[PDB]
Design a binder for this molecule. Structure first.
Ligand SMILES: Nc1nc2c(c(=O)[nH]1)N[C@H]1C(S)=C(S)[C@@H](COP(=O)(O)OP(=O)(O)OC[C@H]3O[C@@H](n4cnc5c(=O)[nH]c(N)nc54)[C@H](O)[C@@H]3O)O[C@H]1N2
Ligand SMILES: Nc1nc2c(c(=O)[nH]1)N[C@H]1C(S)=C(S)[C@@H](COP(=O)(O)OP(=O)(O)OC[C@H]3O[C@@H](n4cnc5c(=O)[nH]c(N)nc54)[C@H](O)[C@@H]3O)O[C@H]1N2
Ligand code: SF4
Ligand code: SF4
Ligand code: SF4
Ligand code: SF4
Ligand code: FES
Ligand code: FES
Ligand SMILES: [Mo+6]
Ligand SMILES: [S]
Lengths: 69, 148, 949
């Protein structure tokens, strides 16, 4: 019962976590450069709705994601 | 108990330089020929291919492809031994056994060797790891007598 | 142009200082090692030769290349005679005429006079060298002959009956001239020693150690058939058909090695395909597929007319082009106006050219008005383009395949070049037999490890999934020790990041002694391998689908690049981090867009400076948002908000994971167009169908793994009447774009003008030079054979902290074993091209390489039927017990659709590029008779849906 989008986000976070320096900036930039409108919207909705099964790094990076029109 | 013997042989010749020839010698000495069921393991343990292991076996005459008879009779056919009448010995002997040159059987196997070092003793033969020289038309009698 | 192409020179070309010599009154200048024969060839003075070829080293068998040299006693052979300064040689004296006549006499005394009724008439090297010397009589009344079926008093014991076991070539020894150009080629070039000379002397006959070629260790490469002068080993297509007249240079539609072939043609009927001795990808060598498997183009199952359906449950309808395109465009515009432009999408094909790929990405971007495009790259080698982008800056290779000639070590992670890329494996073995060392990190014993006349070799037989732990351990070993190059780091890379990387990797938890528990590889062996890799002067990494296709692929690739940067194996011939690309033009497809986040040239889509240029060149407004990926596409279609799809040259059903889910997502799709040659697994859910064109009927280019741009020429004529780019522009104009392309030259010009790298690319260049590496601008006009030679592309390499995360595909009670999926040499990925050939001999059924100890407990035996009870499906397959794989590991193949293998595969994928996890799946292998509940339904659907009316 994991949403594919949440899963991908948590994966990306688990990766970008072990890195040095800004860990959330790169995450947000990647999510912005790779994901589409509906997906970004869904993820933002997730992070705004406080859905469980999510990495706090993603919760922190969400505000920095490329805005959805 | 074929795989066992072969593995032992290959272990005995492990790490050598150009160990194919010795391994094949030992194999032939054990069984009596190079079985086609032993072209692969040798190749594997040596890092060769069945093809090369077969080519090597084919090129060389000392490696039998099938077994010989209970007895073997090699008979020089070179110049010196020819000089002092090897043809006559050959004829007498092949009439005695009834097997022409190269013609094998389950009883014996008459073949050529083309030298034994017994050049001074021109008529020379190898009967079952026993060399014989000065093979007149009388010695053949004893050759066949001890050789049923 | 070079002579090595048109003319068969005598001996291989050597490197050395300039040596001057006089060949029959002609001054010549050639390297020192070069032989007399090759120099005479280069001088235009031809000397008769039959047993000497460029592919292999010379041997003194024929004795027909004899030449009188001043200062040398007798008539020495040119082939085995190295040139010396000031040497004056005489090619044709009377004595030599006489001697050559005599030798040809001795030949022909044992040869049948079947000339004029033999396959190789006009293409035989014995006939022209028998006429060249001027043989007019044979005085030897021969009684002992090999060809005579019946000798005096009865049968000839020497006569060996013909062998037609192999469906592609035949071996008639009656015509053999023992010269051994077959043996020499099979041993020196291909590297599989399957041919030998059985016997001593006149009795000597070529033979494999088996009854027939097929039963032997022959992989069907045709290097013996290419090097056999006297029709002994001959292609069957030359027996059925006459000897060909003209030649045309094309390339293979497989493997991404880009082996350059010349199709020998008799009118329009393709007689055969033989390598060209050109292209640095293959120097006159090939494999079964490209060499022989080209009969799919002449198959009856090929579809040649458009077909419209209007409902999958309804039958097809053979239809002309106009109304087909009309219906298609109508439905497309409807769906577009209803659900939006983002409700569409395309799936480009690597199999196709880069011109067609460009047209398709244009169709998806300019016409449709979306960024939803994709390709096969997304299931294979997408993580590569992320890792090597994050580290170096280029999402591509680093070296060519000639680099391997100068390597001193080869580290192979997740590759099987003996099957995947045979012609690369050949040139690898060429080196392995010459001292170079080898490390293999695959969990499964590959045939590259068991190569003959091998040097040293290490094999890290690990557990699938733990590929980054091993790399991390290698790094820990190299860093705890001090073997790495500090000068390289300080010059080409950064230090401040290197310090952090070292302080991280130097932790004693990522050490080889702790990973042995989870990885399964011994510690000492790993340390030894690491030390060997670090110590060697010029090492080279070759990686494939054992790193990319995993839950952590980009991470592994990054670790590998870190290794390659640390050690200093970059920016030089013999060293580099080479991904082994798959399909042809995967590189070219990825370069020409084929991705939902970029434009042609690996430029991001959000780049305003790029979008401007493209809106200016196409005169249309483009989007700045990145598009959906195939997984996303299918998940959407399942959820909705995705209705259309234009599948070009791809099988989204058989060649994709979770067959159930992808099928459910392909079904809920108001329109799914198909553009393949044959009726495919994907076309069972189609509403429309547009025929395609083979590489023989095409015209354009292919961008292979080593960034090489090979040129594809038209030999036949399109049987559907139109090539793929023609169909694509048809569709585009029918929708309203307004393109006018009459030749792909204009398209390539467009490409050049738009993106850089291809700015200097022109078909004339490709013809003259022959091949080009795509990084070719005004700077570096000739090309870029080697990347990062002078500093990296981004400017400074980047060391990234990689780590091992436990995969979610761990194994448990009801799924104890693991799973893997791979390939075979004979058959290609889905075998829609190859199953329709005679390559169903070597592989006609997919099987399961299970371990013996993991078979006894279950009751499995070789040849039994088993079921793979997985989590994401179920399937049945024929077993094969083998000690190749490790215990607790399994290996399947996906070439055949009768067995739905990808229904077992799970949806789990990489994090960055979402490349699926094909190489890990927790399964349960049990014994069963009934095939399956899924395979049955699939067969039923395919039967009820492939009916035409
Ligand atoms: N279990 C498992 N599954 C895998 C993989 C794995 O390793 N394991 N690998 C994945 C990867 S590496 C990839 S490349 C895919 C490859 O497999 P696919 O992506 O399926 O591509 P192909 O095998 O070429 O066949 C697909 C269709 O396109 C058609 N076609 C071929 N040439 C042409 C042409 O010139 N013009 C046109 N118009 N059509 C053409 C073919 O005939 C066929 O019908 O498989 C993926 N699936
Ligand atoms: N004759 C023929 N040629 C082909 C193809 C074909 O199907 N037939 N396919 C084409 C295509 S499109 C592809 S992508 C290319 C690439 O083809 P390759 O790069 O050769 O990839 P594969 O043969 O699928 O398998 C890679 C090897 O690594 C092993 N492995 C599995 N899991 C792991 C792991 O966790 N770690 C490590 N280190 N290794 C692992 C696999 O079991 C297998 O032996 O080849 C192309 N060439
Ligand atoms: S192989 Fe050549 S020489 Fe021999 S019969 Fe055929 S065409 Fe004549
Ligand atoms: S086809 Fe290739 S592998 Fe087979 S015998 Fe000929 S050269 Fe050797
Ligand atoms: S088969 Fe052909 S290449 Fe081989 S020895 Fe005979 S004639 Fe020469
Ligand atoms: S499949 Fe690969 S190695 Fe074989 S001919 Fe085609 S490009 Fe060359
Ligand atoms: S010649 Fe027969 S003995 Fe030496
Ligand atoms: S011609 Fe040079 S030896 Fe055969
Ligand atoms: Mo691929
Ligand atoms: S691929």
């Amino acid at each position: 019962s994991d949403d594919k989008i949440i899963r991908m986000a948590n994966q990306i976070a688990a990766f970008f976590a072990v890195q040095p320096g800004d860990r959330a900036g790169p995450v947000a930039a990647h999510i912005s450069e790779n994901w589409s409108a509906p997906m970004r919207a869904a993820l933002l909705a997730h992070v705004a709705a406080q859905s469980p099964g999510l990495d706090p790094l993603v919760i922190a990076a969400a505000p920095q994601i490329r805005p959805v029109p | 108990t074929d795989t066992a013997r072969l593995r032992a042989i290959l272990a005995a010749h492990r790490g050598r330089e150009g160990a194919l020839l010795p391994i094949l010698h030992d194999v032939q000495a054990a069984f009596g020929f190079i079985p086609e069921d032993a072209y692969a393991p040798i190749a594997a343990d040596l890092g060769l291919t069945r093809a090369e292991v077969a080519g090597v076996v084919g090129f060389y005459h000392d490696f039998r492809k099938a077994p010989a008879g209970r007895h073997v009779i090699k008979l020089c056919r070179a110049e010196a031994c020819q000089a002092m009448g090897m043809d006559a010995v050959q004829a007498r002997l092949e009439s005695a056994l009834g097997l022409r040159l190269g013609d094998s059987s389950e009883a014996v196997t008459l073949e050529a060797v083309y030298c034994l070092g017994l050049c001074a003793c021109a008529p020379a033969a190898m009967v079952d790891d026993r060399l014989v020289g000065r093979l007149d038309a009388a010695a053949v009698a004893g050759i066949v007598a001890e050789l049923g | 142009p070079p002579l090595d192409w048109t003319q068969d020179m005598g001996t291989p070309k050597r490197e050395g200082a300039p040596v001057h010599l006089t060949i029959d009154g002609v001054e010549v200048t050639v390297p020192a090692g070069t032989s007399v024969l090759r120099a005479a060839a280069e001088a235009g003075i031809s000397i008769p030769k039959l047993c000497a070829t460029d592919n292999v080293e010379p041997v003194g068998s024929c004795r027909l290349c004899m030449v009188e040299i001043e200062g040398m006693r007798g008539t020495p052979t040119s082939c085995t005679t190295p040139v010396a300064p000031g040497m004056r040689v005489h090619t044709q004296t009377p004595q030599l005429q006489k001697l050559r006549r005599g030798v040809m006499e001795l030949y022909i005394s044992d040869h049948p006079l079947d000339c004029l009724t033999c396959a190789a008439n006009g293409d035989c090297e014995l006939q022209d060298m028998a006429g060249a010397v001027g043989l007019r009589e044979v005085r030897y009344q021969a009684k002992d002959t090999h060809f005579a079926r019946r000798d005096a008093t009865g049968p000839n014991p020497r006569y060996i009956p013909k062998d037609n076991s192999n469906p592609y070539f035949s071996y008639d020894p009656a015509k053999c001239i023992v010269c051994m150009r077959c043996v020499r080629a099979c041993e020196e070039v291909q590297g599989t020693f399957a041919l030998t000379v059985m016997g001593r002397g006149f009795d000597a006959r070529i033979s494999p150690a088996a009854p027939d070629f097929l039963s032997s260790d022959c992989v069907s490469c045709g290097a013996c058939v290419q090097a056999c002068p006297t029709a002994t080993l001959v292609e069957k297509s030359v027996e059925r058909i006459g000897t060909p007249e003209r030649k045309v240079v094309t390339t293979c539609a497989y493997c991404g090695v880009g082996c350059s072939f010349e199709a020998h043609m008799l009118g329009d009927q393709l007689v055969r395909m033989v390598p060209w001795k050109g292209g640095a990808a293959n120097r006159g060598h090939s494999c079964v597929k490209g060499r022989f498997a080209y009969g799919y183009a002449t198959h009856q199952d090929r579809i040649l007319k458009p077909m419209i359906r209007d409902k999958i449950t309804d039958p097809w309808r053979e239809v002309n082009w106009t109304e087909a395109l009309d219906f298609t465009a109508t439905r497309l515009r409807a769906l577009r106006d209803s659900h939006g432009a983002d409700a569409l999408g395309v799936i480009t094909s690597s199999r196709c050219t880069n011109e067609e790929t460009y047209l398709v990405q244009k169709l998806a971007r300019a016409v449709f008005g979306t960024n939803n495009t994709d390709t096969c790259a997304r299931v294979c080698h997408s993580p590569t383009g992320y890792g090597l982008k994050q580290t170096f800056g280029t999402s591509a290779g680093t070296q060519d395949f000639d680099s391997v000639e100068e390597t001193d070590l080869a580290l192979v992670i997740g590759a099987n070049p003996t099957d995947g890329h045979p012609v690369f494996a050949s040139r690898l073995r060429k080196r392995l037999r010459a001292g170079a060392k080898l490390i293999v990190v695959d969990p499964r014993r590959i045939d590259l490890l068991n190569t003959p006349h091998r040097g040293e070799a290490w094999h890290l037989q690990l557990k699938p999934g733990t590929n980054v732990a091993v790399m991390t351990a290698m790094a820990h070993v190299i860093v705890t020790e001090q073997i790495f190059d500090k000068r390289f780091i300080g010059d080409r890379c950064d230090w401040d990041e290197w310090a952090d990387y070292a302080e991280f990797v130097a932790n004693p938890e990522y050490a080889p002694e702790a990973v042995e528990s989870l990885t399964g590889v011994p510690a000492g062996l790993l340390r030894q391998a690491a030390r060997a890799y670090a110590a060697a002067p010029n090492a080279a990494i070759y990686y494939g689908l054992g790193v990319t296709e995993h839950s952590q692929g980009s991470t592994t690739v990054i670790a590998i690049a870190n290794l390659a940067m640390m050690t200093g194996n970059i920016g030089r011939p013999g060293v580099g981090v080479n991904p082994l690309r798959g399909q042809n033009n995967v590189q070219g497809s990825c370069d020409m867009g084929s991705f939902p986040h970029e434009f042609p040239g690996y430029r991001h889509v959000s780049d305003d400076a790029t979008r401007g240029l493209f809106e200016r060149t196409w005169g249309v407004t483009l989007s700045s948002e990145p598009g959906l990926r195939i997984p996303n596409m299918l998940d959407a279609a399942v959820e909705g908000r995705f209705k259309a799809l234009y599948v070009q040259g791809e099988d989204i059903l058989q060649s994709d994971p979770d067959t159930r889910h992808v099928s459910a997502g392909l079904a809920a799709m108001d329109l799914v167009i198909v553009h393949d040659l044959f009726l495919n697994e994907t076309a069972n859910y189609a509403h429309v169908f547009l025929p395609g064109s083979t590489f023989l009927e095409k015209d354009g280019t292919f961008t292979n793994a080593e960034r090489r741009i090979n040129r594809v020429r038209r030999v036949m004529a399109p049987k559907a009447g139109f090539a793929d780019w023609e169909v694509t522009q048809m569709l585009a104009n029918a929708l309203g774009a307004g393109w006018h392309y009459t030749h792909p030259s204009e398209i390539m010009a467009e490409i050049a003008a738009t993106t850089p790298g291809f700015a200097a690319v022109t078909y004339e260049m490709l013809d003259a030079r022959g091949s080009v590496q795509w990084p070719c601008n005004e700077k570096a006009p000739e090309g870029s054979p080697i990347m990062h030679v002078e500093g990296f592309v981004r400017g400074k390499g980047r060391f990234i902290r990689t780590a091992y995360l436990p995969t979610d595909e761990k194994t448990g009670p009801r799924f104890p074993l693991l799973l893997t999926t791979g390939r075979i040499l004979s058959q290609y990925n889905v075998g829609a091209q190859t199953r329709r050939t005679e390559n169903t001999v070597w592989h006609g059924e997919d099987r399961l390489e299970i371990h013996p100890t993991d078979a006894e407990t279950r009751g499995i035996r070789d040849g039994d039927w088993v079921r793979l009870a997985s989590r994401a499906g179920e399937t049945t397959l024929r077993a094969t017990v083998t000690d190749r794989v490790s215990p607790g590991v399994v290996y399947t193949t996906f070439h055949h659709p009768d067995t739905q293998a990808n229904v077992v595969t799970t949806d789990t994928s990489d994090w960055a590029t979402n490349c699926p996890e094909y190489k890990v799946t927790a399964v349960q292998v049990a014994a069963s008779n009934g095939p399956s509940d899924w395979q049955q339904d699939y067969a039923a659907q395919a039967a009820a849906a492939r009916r035409i009316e």
